[PDB]
Structures are given as C-alpha cells and as structure tokens.
Ligand binder design. Structure first.
Ligand code: MYA
Ligand code: QMI
Ligand code: CL
Length: 411
C-alpha cells in the first residue's frame, strides 16, 4: 500500500508498466488556471521558504540540511556531502526557475526542516525504438510518434526531510507543493531517480565502482577483499598493484575543456546521445554550464587533434561523509558524467578519466550502467556494487527500457 503514491499519476505496478506500448501523459489535461494559486496547506508551526540558491548563506543552509540528513547507504557508513559549490552548479542551470526550489522551515526559529529541488531539462521521451517497431507492424506509427518532440520538463532531485521529522508524511506535502509550482509554470511531466523502489521505474541500472585508492576503501569498508586474495602472502600489496594507474594521461592531445570548445562538444555529444531512447537535449548554454570545468565540482577533458575536438569525457565530485570510521572524514568519489568517443575506443578514453581522477586525489570512480558504460567495465576493472538507480517519470506512461537505452546522467 502506498497511501500517497496510489493518488498520483504514475503507473502503479510492474504489471501495468509491462503493458505500456506508447509514450504519453497519464493525468487529465489541465491548464495553468486549473492549478491552485496558493501554496499547499502546512501546519501552522511551519512555513514554505524559497531559498535563493545563488546567495551563499541560503546555499549553506541547504548544504547543512543535506550534509546531515541526505542519502545514506543501507548500513549507515556513508552519507552524501554535496558541496556548496556543487549545489549552486546543480540547482542553477541556464533558465532555472527559482520557485522550483522548495523548502520547509520551522516558523519560530527558521530552522530548515525539508527540501526538494526542480530544474528544467529538455528531454527526448517519446516511444522507444523497440516499441516503434511493434507500432509499425500493427499500423499504429502515428500514435507511437505523437510525443516524439523533446519536451521541456522538470528534473527533481535533493528531496530531504530532516531526521527528526521522518515518517510524519512531510515528503508527500513537499512533492505536492513542488508539483503545484511546476504545473503553475505550464510543465506537467518530471523525471527523477531513486536508489529505492517506488511505483514504478521505466528503467533500472546497477552501480559500478572502480577503486582508485584501495587501501583507503578497504580501511573504511567500502570494499573488501576477494577470498582469492587470501591465497597470497600479502593480500593488500597485491590489491594496490592490481588497481595501479599511470601517473599521466595516455591520449596525446587530451587537455581540459575551454569555453571555445562548447559548440564542438555540443555537436559530438548530441550526435551520440540521439542514439538512446531517453536522453537530454542541450543548448550551447547548457553544455557550457554542465561541462565547463569548475574546481572541486566538474572536470572535463577533450581530445583535440588537427585543431578539432573529436572525443571528450567529464566527471563530477561528490564526497561522502564516512560516518563510523574515526580516521577518515570523507570518501572522495568521482562520478562518470557525459562523454563521446569518435576517434578511439571508449575504454581508452575512459582510462584517461581514471588516470585524471586518481592523480587528483579521488578514491573511487562510480557510475550507473547507463549510456555505454557496460562497454568498459571489465577492461577497466570496475566492479558491480550493491546499489541500483531506478529511473521514473511523473505523469508519463513509458514502456520498460534497458538502462543502456538511458542517456540522462543524474547528479
Ligand atoms: C510535474 C512536476 C512533478 C514534480 C514532482 C515529481 C515527483 C518527485 C518524487 C520525489 C523524487 C525524489 C528523488 C530523490 O531526491 S531520491 C533521494 C531521496 N532522499 C533521501 O533518500 C534522503 C534520506 N531520506 C529522507 O530524507 C526521507 O526518508 C525521505 C524524504 C526520502 C522520505 O521522507 P520520510 O521517510 O520522512 O517519509 P514520509 O512519511 O514523509 O513519506 C512517506 C512517503 O514517501 C514516499 N517516499 C519515500 N522515499 C521516497 C523517494 N526517494 N522518492 C519519492 N517518494 C518517497 C514513500 O513511499 C511514502 O509514500 P507512500 O508509499 O505512503 O505512498
Ligand atoms: C560512497 C557512498 N555514499 N553513499 C551515500 C552511498 C549510498 C555510497 N555507496 S555507493 O556504493 O557509492 C552507492 C551510491 Cl553512490 C548510490 C547508491 Br543508490 C547506492 C550506493 Cl550503495
Ligand atoms: Cl558497493
């Protein structure tokens, strides 16, 4: 039973989602004028607050709420610690809508109690290729193509209720208020992800992890040791050697992305992402925002030869707090972001990502098996983890797809 989710315009079971053949809306059509003008009611001791996520002190308040109360692993050993600069980056892309950043404060002392954030995304989310084939067989091409045009929707992230307020049904109220604010701007779909199972994913992908500092990852119990390593005199020296990386990039012509690369990077990325069923469409402004290097936040390198950008990769940083180990404060993770290879094998491109990350002090490189990430797992010594990232839409029927048909990277 889902007392809140059963009231919302999402498919309600796996069986229902298995039956979906075409993309399109779930809810009755509505207009802006049908949506309440006034914020959703909340208890008198609380208030809605729209932080200013370019104002250092408002970003710091959200930063502390998430530092202390956002996602943990299942054994409460790690908690994300998104930085203030990452939150400004992630929450304020070009043409962001300040009103889609929604917080609850205690009215008395203005203590931040809860948050949810929406940002605009232009997403291709029409009927997937395998379903378009079926539709053709059956003379239903028109229906299947109806919602092919990329749509200006909301991407939700950073839903967080303070630990002391858990299981009080506040998260439904935050969801309904963000829904309201987004529908008042004439947007009626959202995309979101979660590491938990909710009604009802259109795709799910396992996490994968590439050890860059194995001694630390073992110390903090992120990683362990294959029992096979016991057959050795010295399990840990073997482990270090197994994961060792070059000290410098191997692709000649690799260098950091610069602003003048934006149009070439836009072209090679958009050519590559068009091959997947679900994927974002980025303007030059959005390429600049999401890909130009920002210290401590996003790292992006291009391969340039004959003065042409022919490949690139990016990764972003999320440290996690190491909750139980006295000797390390943080686990410094690099996450595979967007990339495109046209001149070299993808494994050869992504090897230099691992090199760069290691050289910069990262402990592990994480990814979900979206894009073509499965194509370099074994050669680059990524291992599958225990996490699974599920992809969802709000108000959008969508057939089940493999995660290798998803090109949207979630921050
Ligand atoms: C058109 C525009 C649409 C805009 C909106 C689009 C939809 C966006 C949807 C949000 C996308 C977020 C994407 C991310 O940010 S995923 C990251 C989620 N955040 C965390 O995991 C941080 C740690 N945990 C918390 O802060 C709290 O435990 C949260 C806030 C998660 C729940 O708080 P609490 O534990 O205090 O519970 P409650 O009594 O208030 O509420 C219980 C209800 O909440 C449902 N629940 C639990 N977890 C999630 C979850 N991850 N997404 C959606 N629903 C969730 C649960 O099934 C139940 O409903 P029902 O089972 O009774 O029916
Ligand atoms: C390093 C780390 N920080 N946090 C908050 C979690 C859950 C981890 N572990 S993890 O391996 O990288 C991981 C991550 Cl990033 C995301 C999910 Br969903 C599940 C897991 Cl288990
Ligand atoms: Cl793991």
């Amino acid at each position: 039973a889902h007392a809140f989710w059963s009231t919302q315009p999402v498919p309600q079971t796996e069986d229902e989602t298995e039956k979906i053949v075409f993309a399109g809306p779930m809810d009755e059509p509505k207009t802006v004028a049908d949506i309440p003008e006034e914020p959703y009611p909340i208890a008198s001791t609380f208030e809605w607050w729209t932080p200013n996520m370019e104002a250092a002190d408002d970003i710091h308040a959200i930063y502390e709420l998430l530092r202390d109360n956002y996602v943990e692993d299942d054994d409460s050993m790690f908690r994300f610690n998104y930085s203030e600069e990452f939150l400004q980056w992630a929450l304020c892309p070009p043409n962001y809508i300040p009103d889609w950043h929604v917080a609850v404060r205690r009215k008395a002392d203005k203590k931040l109690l809860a948050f949810i954030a929406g940002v605009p995304v232009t997403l291709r989310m029409g009927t997937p290729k395998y379903m378009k084939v079926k539709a053709q067989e059956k003379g239903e091409g028109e229906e299947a193509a109806k919602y092919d045009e990329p749509r200006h929707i909301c991407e939700i992230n950073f839903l967080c209720v303070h630990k002391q307020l858990r299981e009080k049904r506040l998260a439904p109220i935050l969801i309904k208020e963000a829904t309201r604010r987004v529908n008042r701007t004439n947007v009626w779909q959202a995309v979101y992800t979660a590491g938990v199972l909710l009604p009802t994913p259109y795709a799910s992908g396992q996490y994968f992890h590439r050890s860059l500092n194995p001694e630390k990852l073992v110390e903090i119990r992120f990683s362990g040791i294959p029992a096979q390593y016991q057959k050795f005199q010295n399990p840990m020296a073997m482990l270090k050697r197994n994961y060792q990386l070059p000290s410098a990039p191997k692709n000649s012509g690799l260098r950091e992305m610069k602003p003048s690369d934006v149009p070439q990077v836009r072209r090679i990325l958009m050519n590559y992402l068009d091959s997947f069923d679900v994927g974002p469409v980025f303007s030059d402004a959005e390429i600049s925002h999401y890909l130009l290097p920002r210290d401590g936040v996003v790292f992006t390198y291009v391969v340039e030869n004959d003065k042409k950008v022919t490949d690139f990769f990016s990764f972003y940083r999320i440290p996690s707090t190491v909750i139980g180990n006295s000797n390390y404060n943080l686990l410094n993770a690099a996450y595979v972001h967007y990339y495109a290879a046209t001149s070299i094998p993808l494994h050869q491109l992504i090897l230099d990502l691992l090199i760069v990350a290691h050289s910069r002090g990262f402990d592990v490189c994480n990814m979900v098996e979206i894009l073509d990430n499965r194509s370099f797992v074994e050669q680059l010594k990524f291992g599958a983890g225990d996490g699974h990232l599920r992809y969802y839409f709000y108000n959008w029927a969508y057939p089940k797809i493999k995660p290798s048909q998803v090109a949207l990277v979630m921050l």
